[PDB]
Amino acid sequence: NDESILLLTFLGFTGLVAKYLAPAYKDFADARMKKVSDVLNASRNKHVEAVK
Amino acid sequence: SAWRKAGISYAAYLNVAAQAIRSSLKTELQTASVLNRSQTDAFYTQYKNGTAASEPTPI
């Protein structure tokens, strides 16, 4: 069936995405989360040192 | 030819070219300046934070 091969192929690209794109994108996204967190803590540090 | 990649550097290219030009010439052309060019005694030494002299290797 034409509709049989299509669903299997879509499962294939979902598996490929989870195997390759999902980990790399996860690392990039978590790195950006971490960068935002450290700049927030740097802002807090600047505030508390200025108050001190 | 391969001074940048395989050779030492471009300065080595000029060094070898000048040495070949001076040495491979006529006997009467080996003047005092050519003698100074041939004679090299730059004993460079690698110092450090504690002035650890590695070695005065010839140039």
Binding site: E3, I5, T9, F10, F13, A29, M33, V36, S37 | -
Partner: protein, 221 residues
């Protein structure tokens, strides 16, 4: 087709409404997927239409950008949502954008807008030819925007459809149950990764072209 166009409205409305657990400043896992694209959009818009009134003339280029890139995204589902295989809407709104920048130039400049078809310095004996040289290209690039997106998306939809229909004797009766007999599936998967790539890149490049036409409209070159 109407119910299918509402679906893309629901998916991208949920991009933020159904994403932020408490609207945290750190951002959720799907708020990032939109602020990153927003950052890219603001970056190359200030790159291309950089100067005054760029901010006032950014939002509709942005709106076209998400329109087109989720429109390409929904063309990955196997019952591909490639505008229900009609794709004439791209042409109609490309003509709409052409009329929009034409009116932009005619109001911002007026009679100076006719100087958009002639550059700053041209030879006197050669200007009457180059004016008509540069005019018809401008009125013609009102279908060039449409056929690009139409080409890529529906070409992909019909090539996967054609490959799937052509895949009749691969494992049922054919004894070659290996990649030699499974070339259809292999090139289908290759052309689908290609399709995703060309869809995202073509959305970005059409954003560039629309920004370029807006720059030609609000400014003079």
């Amino acid at each position: 087709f109407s119910l299918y166009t509402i679906i893309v409205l629901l998916v991208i409305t949920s991009l933020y409404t159904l994403t932020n657990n408490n609207n945290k400043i750190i951002g959720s896992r799907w708020l990032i997927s939109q602020e990153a694209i927003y950052d890219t959009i603001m970056n190359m818009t200030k790159g291309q239409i950089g100067g005054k009134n760029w901010g006032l003339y950014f939002p509709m280029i942005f709106t076209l950008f998400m329109f087109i890139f989720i429109a390409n995204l929904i063309s990955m589902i196997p019952y591909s949502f490639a505008l229900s295989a009609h794709l004439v809407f791209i042409i109609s709104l490309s003509i709409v954008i052409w009329l929009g920048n034409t009116i932009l130039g005619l109001y911002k400049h007026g009679w100076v807008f006719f100087s958009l078809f002639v550059p700053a310095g041209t030879p006197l004996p050669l200007v009457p030819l180059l004016v008509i040289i540069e005019t018809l290209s401008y009125f013609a690039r009102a279908i060039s925007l449409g056929l690009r997106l139409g080409s890529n998306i529906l070409a992909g939809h019909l090539l996967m459809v054609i490959l799937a229909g052509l895949t009749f004797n691969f494992m049922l009766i054919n004894l070659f149950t290996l990649v030699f007999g499974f070339v259809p599936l292999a090139m289908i998967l290759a052309i689908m990764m290609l399709e995703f790539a060309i869809g995202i890149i073509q959305g970005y490049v059409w954003a560039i072209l629309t920004a370029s036409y807006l720059k030609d409209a609000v400014y003079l070159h």
